[PDB]
Amino acid sequence: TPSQKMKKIRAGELSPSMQQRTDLPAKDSSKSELQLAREQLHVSVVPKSLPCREREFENIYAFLEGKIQDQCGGCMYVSGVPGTGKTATVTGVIRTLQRMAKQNELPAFEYLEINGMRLTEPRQAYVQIYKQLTGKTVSWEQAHALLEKRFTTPAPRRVTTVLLVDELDILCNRRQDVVYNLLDWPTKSAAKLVVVTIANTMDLPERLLMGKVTSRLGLTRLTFQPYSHKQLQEIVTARLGGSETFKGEAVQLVARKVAAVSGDARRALDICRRATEIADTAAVKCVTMLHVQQALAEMIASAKVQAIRNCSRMEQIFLQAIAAEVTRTGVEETTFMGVYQQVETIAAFMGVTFPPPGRALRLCSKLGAERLIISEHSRNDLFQKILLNVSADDIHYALRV
Amino acid sequence: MEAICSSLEPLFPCREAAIETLGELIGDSSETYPSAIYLFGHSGTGKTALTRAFLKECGKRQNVRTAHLNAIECYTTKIMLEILLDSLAPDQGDALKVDNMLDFVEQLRRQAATRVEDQGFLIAVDNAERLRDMDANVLPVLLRLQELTNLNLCVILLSQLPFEKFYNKTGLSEIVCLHLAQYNKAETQRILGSDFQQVRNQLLEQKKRLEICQEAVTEDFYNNYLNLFLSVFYKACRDVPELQLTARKCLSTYLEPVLDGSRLWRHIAGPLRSALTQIYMRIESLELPYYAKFLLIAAFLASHNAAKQDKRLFVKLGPKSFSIDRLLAIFYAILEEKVGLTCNLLSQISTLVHLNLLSFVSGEQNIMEGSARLQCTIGLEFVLQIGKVVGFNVRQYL
Amino acid sequence: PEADRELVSIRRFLKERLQRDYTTLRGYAKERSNVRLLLQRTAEMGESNSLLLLGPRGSGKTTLINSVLADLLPNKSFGENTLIVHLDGNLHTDDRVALKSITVQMQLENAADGKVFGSFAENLAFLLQCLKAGGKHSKSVIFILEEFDLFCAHHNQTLLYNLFDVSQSAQAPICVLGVTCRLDVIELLEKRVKSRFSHRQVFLFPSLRRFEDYVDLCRDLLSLPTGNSLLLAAEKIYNLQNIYFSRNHFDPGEYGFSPRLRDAWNKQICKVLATQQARSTLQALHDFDISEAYLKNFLFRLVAHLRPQSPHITAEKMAAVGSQFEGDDKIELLCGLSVLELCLIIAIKHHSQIYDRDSFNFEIIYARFSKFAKVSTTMQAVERSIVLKAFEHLRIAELIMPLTVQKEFEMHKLALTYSQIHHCMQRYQALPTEVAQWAQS
Amino acid sequence: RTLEQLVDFVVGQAEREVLPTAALLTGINQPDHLSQFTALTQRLHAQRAAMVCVLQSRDCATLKAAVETLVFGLVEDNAEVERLRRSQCTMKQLKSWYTNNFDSERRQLVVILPDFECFNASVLQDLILILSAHCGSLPFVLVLGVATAMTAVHGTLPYHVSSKIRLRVFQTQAAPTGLNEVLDKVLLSPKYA
Amino acid sequence: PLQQKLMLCTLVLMLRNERNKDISMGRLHEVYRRVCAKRNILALDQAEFTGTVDLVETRGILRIMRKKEPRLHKVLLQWDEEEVHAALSDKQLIASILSDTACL
Numbered sequence A: 001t002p003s004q005k006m007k008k009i010r011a012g013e014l015s016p017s018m019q020q021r022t023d024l025p026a027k028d029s030s031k032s033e034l035q036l037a038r039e040q041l042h043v044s045v046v047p048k049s050l051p052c053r054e055r056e057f058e059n060i061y062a063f064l065e066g067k068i069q070d071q072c073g074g075c076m077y078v079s080g081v082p083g084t085g086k087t088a089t090v091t092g093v094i095r096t097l098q099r100m101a102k103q104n105e106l107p108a109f110e111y112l113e114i115n116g117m118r119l120t121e122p123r124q125a126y127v128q129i130y131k132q133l134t135g136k137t138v139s140w141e142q143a144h145a146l147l148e149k150r151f152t153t154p155a156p157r158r159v160t161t162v163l164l165v166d167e168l169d170i171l172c173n174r175r176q177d178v179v180y181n182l183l184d185w186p187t188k189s190a191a192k193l194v195v196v197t198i199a200n201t202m203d204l205p206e207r208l209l210m211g212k213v214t215s216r217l218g219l220t221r222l223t224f225q226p227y228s229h230k231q232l233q234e235i236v237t238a239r240l241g242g243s244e245t246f247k248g249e250a251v252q253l254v255a256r257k258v259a260a261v262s263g264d265a266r267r268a269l270d271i272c273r274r275a276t277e278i279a280d281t282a283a284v285k286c287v288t289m290l291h292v293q294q295a296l297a298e299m300i301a302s303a304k305v306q307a308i309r310n311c312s313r314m315e316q317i318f319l320q321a322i323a324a325e326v327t328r329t330g331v332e333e334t335t336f337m338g339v340y341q342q343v344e345t346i347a348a349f350m351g352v353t354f355p356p357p358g359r360a361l362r363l364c365s366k367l368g369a370e371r372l373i374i375s376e377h378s379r380n381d382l383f384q385k386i387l388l389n390v391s392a393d394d395i396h397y398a399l400r401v
Numbered sequence B: 001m002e003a004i005c006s007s008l009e010p011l012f013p014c015r016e017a018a019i020e021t022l023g024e025l026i027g028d029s030s031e032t033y034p035s036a037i038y039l040f041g042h043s044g045t046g047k048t049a050l051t052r053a054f055l056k057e058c059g060k061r062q063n064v065r066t067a068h069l070n071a072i073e074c075y076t077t078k079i080m081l082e083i084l085l086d087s088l089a090p091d092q093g094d095a096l097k098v099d100n101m102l103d104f105v106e107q108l109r110r111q112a113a114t115r116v117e118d119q120g121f122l123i124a125v126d127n128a129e130r131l132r133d134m135d136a137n138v139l140p141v142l143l144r145l146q147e148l149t150n151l152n153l154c155v156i157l158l159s160q161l162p163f164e165k166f167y168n169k170t171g172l173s174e175i176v177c178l179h180l181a182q183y184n185k186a187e188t189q190r191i192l193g194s195d196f197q198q199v200r201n202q203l204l205e206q207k208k209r210l211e212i213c214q215e216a217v218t219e220d221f222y223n224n225y226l227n228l229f230l231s232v233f234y235k236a237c238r239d240v241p242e243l244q245l246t247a248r249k250c251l252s253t254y255l256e257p258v259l260d261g262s263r264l265w266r267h268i269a270g271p272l273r274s275a276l277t278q279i280y281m282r283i284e285s286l287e288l289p290y291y292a293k294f295l296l297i298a299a300f301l302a303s304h305n306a307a308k309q310d311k312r313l314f315v316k317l318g319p320k321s322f323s324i325d326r327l328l329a330i331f332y333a334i335l336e337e338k339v340g341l342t343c344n345l346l347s348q349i350s351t352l353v354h355l356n357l358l359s360f361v362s363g364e365q366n367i368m369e370g371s372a373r374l375q376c377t378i379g380l381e382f383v384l385q386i387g388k389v390v391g392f393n394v395r396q397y398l
Numbered sequence C: 001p002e003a004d005r006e007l008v009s010i011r012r013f014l015k016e017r018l019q020r021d022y023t024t025l026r027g028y029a030k031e032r033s034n035v036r037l038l039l040q041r042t043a044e045m046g047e048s049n050s051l052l053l054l055g056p057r058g059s060g061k062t063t064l065i066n067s068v069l070a071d072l073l074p075n076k077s078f079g080e081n082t083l084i085v086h087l088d089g090n091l092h093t094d095d096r097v098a099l100k101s102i103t104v105q106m107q108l109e110n111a112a113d114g115k116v117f118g119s120f121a122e123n124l125a126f127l128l129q130c131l132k133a134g135g136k137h138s139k140s141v142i143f144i145l146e147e148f149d150l151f152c153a154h155h156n157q158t159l160l161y162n163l164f165d166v167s168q169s170a171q172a173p174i175c176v177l178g179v180t181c182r183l184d185v186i187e188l189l190e191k192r193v194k195s196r197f198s199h200r201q202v203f204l205f206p207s208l209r210r211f212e213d214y215v216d217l218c219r220d221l222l223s224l225p226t227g228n229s230l231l232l233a234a235e236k237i238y239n240l241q242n243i244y245f246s247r248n249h250f251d252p253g254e255y256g257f258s259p260r261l262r263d264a265w266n267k268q269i270c271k272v273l274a275t276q277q278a279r280s281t282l283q284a285l286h287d288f289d290i291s292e293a294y295l296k297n298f299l300f301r302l303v304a305h306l307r308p309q310s311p312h313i314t315a316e317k318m319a320a321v322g323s324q325f326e327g328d329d330k331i332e333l334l335c336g337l338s339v340l341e342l343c344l345i346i347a348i349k350h351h352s353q354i355y356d357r358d359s360f361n362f363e364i365i366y367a368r369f370s371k372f373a374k375v376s377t378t379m380q381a382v383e384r385s386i387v388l389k390a391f392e393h394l395r396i397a398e399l400i401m402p403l404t405v406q407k408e409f410e411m412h413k414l415a416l417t418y419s420q421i422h423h424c425m426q427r428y429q430a431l432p433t434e435v436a437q438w439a440q441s
Numbered sequence D: 001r002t003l004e005q006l007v008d009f010v011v012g013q014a015e016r017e018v019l020p021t022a023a024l025l026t027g028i029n030q031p032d033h034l035s036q037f038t039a040l041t042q043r044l045h046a047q048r049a050a051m052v053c054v055l056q057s058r059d060c061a062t063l064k065a066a067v068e069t070l071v072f073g074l075v076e077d078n079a080e081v082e083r084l085r086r087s088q089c090t091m092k093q094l095k096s097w098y099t100n101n102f103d104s105e106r107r108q109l110v111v112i113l114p115d116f117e118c119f120n121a122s123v124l125q126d127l128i129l130i131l132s133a134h135c136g137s138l139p140f141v142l143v144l145g146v147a148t149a150m151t152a153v154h155g156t157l158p159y160h161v162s163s164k165i166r167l168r169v170f171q172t173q174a175a176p177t178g179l180n181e182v183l184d185k186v187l188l189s190p191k192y193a
Numbered sequence E: 001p002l003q004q005k006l007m008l009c010t011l012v013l014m015l016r017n018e019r020n021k022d023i024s025m026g027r028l029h030e031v032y033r034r035v036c037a038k039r040n041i042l043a044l045d046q047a048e049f050t051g052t053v054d055l056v057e058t059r060g061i062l063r064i065m066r067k068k069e070p071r072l073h074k075v076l077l078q079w080d081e082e083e084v085h086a087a088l089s090d091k092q093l094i095a096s097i098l099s100d101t102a103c104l
């Protein structure tokens, strides 16, 4: 019966299996070189040694090796914009430390890991930490009690435990008891707990954490700066290996046009994959520069001029008249009645007749659906406020040119 | 199709084009329905009764499953889905459980069967203007319920408004708008004359008066009476129920020179203009205590007489707000007997508030602290009637 | 009779092609090939992708996904190595409801015939544990997120973060395909969700902005196709029903038209669409809305009038349905009012023209109306209560809106323009000349 | 006398779409007429012509609470003549509960509103529209407790709500008249020392 | 990055030349587009510009007051202008952008 199966699931005795394919997967020898480049340029394929993150690797490795060898416990906070190699470098450090512990060069340790965005409440961190120790799924009150009995009571031989906490800003709330508990347990001498906390903003400990939590969080911090155009090219030409599938100027264009916007590594490794997919359907074996140009135009999209050009005739007269009412009144927020007056003026100039204000309200709702304009519910006709979401110069670029 | 239209045209005169359009769209059950119909009109144009008769006739003659709602009883969406799935999946009993829109669509998808039986579903949602004041995924889902359930169904909406009051920030699907125009004078005369046989059979049951009744109560007599009735009553209302309800009583008053023995238009044109003054009242002297009367006229003088003027009047557009201290000051100014403040006077203030003769425009959480503001909610004629029954003139203090 | 039944079959065929037929599309050669190649590379090679179908409402976004899935699903290499999870932002209003639907549709070990056990956190942990334990040997999951902008409104975007995070991890090969109508849905995402999203965005702006493409579409939507094309489409629909919309589809195999009937109907349709009146009506519709849903609404209203007494489509019928489409409806509500409400609306228009759209009241409009009614000699005997009930009839029909106080003293706004009232004065039947003279001044 | 007229009104509706309703022009003093309504329920339960729910103004702050107390009052009333949780008190359960018992027999469903002026206006209008929507299926009679005058009824009921209303006015005696009757027949009676 | 440099320079220019410091995202994007079109660099649309300002918010230079629509989000500079001049370290570009009042 499924209820016994769920009681086995909460006990952790039955593996959460997933369905298997009926057909065997494709072999590596059948793949083309463009296909090998497209599967090496994936963002899920992490390298064993990350390029251009050697100094941060040395910093986190020296920190965690020192806290393991001294058997003391403490805390760390690494930060940076997304895509900058934080979680990959931290898990690479911990994989290197576990390889050292399996070769008896380091004392053995436990590695628990949670994520702030994989939880439905911040209180479920107690459930997910305790699940990775025993396997049992319990309530968060009993899990909190068992974790406090584990960490606050001295019991030789306690093994060192390393708790990585991704997305620390989600574990914060108003009361801040979960983050206080996770950063307060290293302060006790009975707990050999080393906490690494990953978040995005650099000033998270002073912005939204309290004073005692910022005191416990320490000052041993690391920042992951965004990738420059040299580093973000080195990453992609490391992923390609020794292959000659990509031109040298194409990767330089990808790095120069991604590093100027965000410094994300996922953005570059997705634009190069899209360029490979463009070069595949063009029946060529190399990814030249115009394939990268088409991929850069597709991924970094700007499709509001295409929407205004493909609007209907009455929609374009309405879009001209909202900008005319903005120019006339000066303010950016216009009521529907002045817009309809300018609509009838522009339609009288253009030689067309316009629909009545009901179908004009339908046009306003249709443009507000595309978010070309911002408009209210149509229950307040003739007095609803109409913001112009597109700029007024894009309308004149689309309807003249 | 033609059986439904041939059945509905007797009961609904002057609506042949609307019945014909609804028979074009959702008449036959074998042909596919449009995703939604929105018929609208004024009050009394017959959109609840026509869709009820259409849904009953379709469920009688064909394989359709109908569901007529009212959006006022559906204060949350679970009520609407429970009525909808009770009607569209009948004989489910007390085992029916609907949680949300997803479970409603998932249980409606199971109702699909083979195409040999030609089944359909029809949903009429009366008073559809309430759907925009609820959970904001009800009206977008109901306009595409045929696409979601992959089933031959139509969602009819009934309101007094155009569909241009219904567009929201997210956009809506296509709808087939239909108009029920209100009748002119000739169509309303035909509707009022369609029950001439029911009128004659009611009057023949209610003995010289019966033999003078049946010799002339005929078609042209009732048509001329309805002509004289609509000559004075069509100016104020075109509502067919109010005109029927007033025409019955005015016929009961009009028959008397014919029963007892032009030449009738004046004798009814008296009572016709007496009964015109009580249109929209559907009917088939406020005594108060003495200090309640003084407190009520003091509240009227406080709400009317421009509180800067109270220095000149008492020391010896909208109704203005006043505090309880100003009301008691005007009470002690106009009383001229100086009764002491007790429990019963301020209790009379509170029970005049509870009788809706006064009201609380502001405050109402701090009635005792002096920051509460009241306003009087009566007219001058009632105040003058109170001043007549008291002996205190108000127009000197006005 | 036999000639009466062939028109019944033609009307049923055209109605079923207009409302149903969720699979076949017209146009979109590059975008459909993009989506088809993306889902094929997800299902075959085990790649994890993400996509964002974008476009206006009414363009064929759902029809494109139905076409791509109906072309891929009878392959039995797609259909046996891939399970598909459909989610809707209107139906799955929370991450709890969406997650229980994901747990049911993937047939997980705690599903047990549509009744998921455990809390929301247990369902999330079991789903992430199931997807993390898989790999290239596992079945591909294809998530389809319709109304994708409403999934961004959920708390903390946990479902969007977890569906995009599996696409960037060494886990089960999933594909996240969002479909939404907003063109700037990517600024609704949080920066982590925006970082994990692969920014490929397919736009579906409709390719019938030119009027001749609109006329060609209206011709192809009314013509009767050849029997060989009907046989090919019926074979495709039978292969789709052999393996969701497939239960009640078009199924064009039940309809069979003789070649004389097809040639006569297509000749009459081309002859009508060559005229100037039908092209003027379609020009009015194309000037309003170039979407295919608007044209299909027009053609459904036109096909439904094919009674056996009038078997042909003609340009005057198209002109009648276009005149039905083009009219104002608040003018039709204004002509249904009695003369008392019309005099009240004339007094409201007079007050609004004098005081430059200032707010009015029942007392102000009753004063301005009583100044007319004493000298009108048709409105002398009206009580105050009847005019108040007429004011309430104007208020509940939303020709008067409040500024959102007693019922006779609330301030209001006129919801009409002056042109609508001026056209109502011309279209009104049996309006007395006293009111028509008071309306001009 | 007014009791007999109200019972004849309810029975004459039982002998027989707008709901029939009965405005009772009672006095200023609201605590005095709860005994009048209790006697009306006792006379309606004596003939078994109807079953009565009394909707106080304190129970009807919203439309949800008004419909819930209405269905709960009618269900518990018929339960007490010969229990559902209040969140399960819907109009569909009232229809099924009426179809189970009294469709085989026609028992009216009298709804007293003793303090008509204290009710919320919008909740009252929606309640009257709901009770008017269920006519034919469920027989509803709506006796009222209007205290001031009929102008309050004609003012708080708009154009659309009053069109579904078939009211008939009754008049209770004035409070000084009842005082003079008590003062002449009790406090001046010779039998009391 | 270059686009965050151009965003910060237009925010400093808009705060220097205007005494109303209630800057919306669309009003900032309109000045950013003209500054980019003056230097003949292709400007981002509103959808990438919102993510760019969101990435500058993480450094602590800004604080974005959230509203109902992403066009109406209010940017609030939380550094003084000399810290921005020292942090951008591209004074040849900063002095070129601050002297161009005409694109506002």
Ligand SMILES: Nc1ncnc2c1ncn2[C@@H]1O[C@H](COP(=O)(O)OP(=O)(O)OP(=O)(O)O)[C@@H](O)[C@H]1O
Residues within 6 Å of the ligand: A043, A044, A045, A046, A047, A050, A051, A052, A053, A081, A082, A083, A084, A085, A086, A087, A088, A089, A199, A200, A235, A265, A266, C168, C192, C195
């Ligand atoms: N220096 C690098 N060399 C090679 N690949 C990299 C490098 N940095 C990042 N990547 C790739 O980019 C992806 C970045 O994901 P990662 O877990 O590093 O995000 P993050 O930096 O932790 O930020 P966030 O989790 O906030 O998005 C990884 O899948 C990794 O394969």
Ligand SMILES: Nc1ncnc2c1ncn2[C@@H]1O[C@H](COP(=O)(O)OP(=O)(O)OP(=O)(O)O)[C@@H](O)[C@H]1O
Residues within 6 Å of the ligand: B011, B012, B013, B014, B015, B042, B043, B044, B045, B046, B047, B048, B049, B050, B160, B191, B240, B241, D017, D160, D163
């Ligand atoms: N054309 C007609 N012929 C005969 N009777 C009619 C006609 N139109 C309406 N009626 C009668 O009028 C009565 C009330 O009409 P109905 O309640 O359908 O109007 P409604 O549009 O529902 O009003 P509301 O908008 O207030 O809900 C019905 O009993 C119906 O029989």
Ligand SMILES: Nc1ncnc2c1ncn2[C@@H]1O[C@H](COP(=O)(O)OP(=O)(O)OP(=O)(O)O)[C@@H](O)[C@H]1O
Residues within 6 Å of the ligand: B173, C018, C024, C025, C026, C027, C028, C056, C057, C058, C059, C060, C061, C062, C063, C064, C181, C292, C293, C296
């Ligand atoms: N390219 C096309 N090919 C075939 N049919 C189309 C096309 N574009 C629009 N349609 C028709 O227009 C209507 C639009 O429906 P569809 O579901 O495809 O659009 P949608 O964008 O998903 O709508 P929504 O966003 O409101 O769900 C359908 O009836 C469809 O048949």
Ligand SMILES: [Mg+2]
Residues within 6 Å of the ligand: A086, A087, A166, A198
């Ligand atoms: Mg991470």
Ligand SMILES: [Mg+2]
Residues within 6 Å of the ligand: B047, B048, B049, B126
């Ligand atoms: Mg109705």
Ligand SMILES: [Mg+2]
Residues within 6 Å of the ligand: C061, C062, C146
């Ligand atoms: Mg769709």
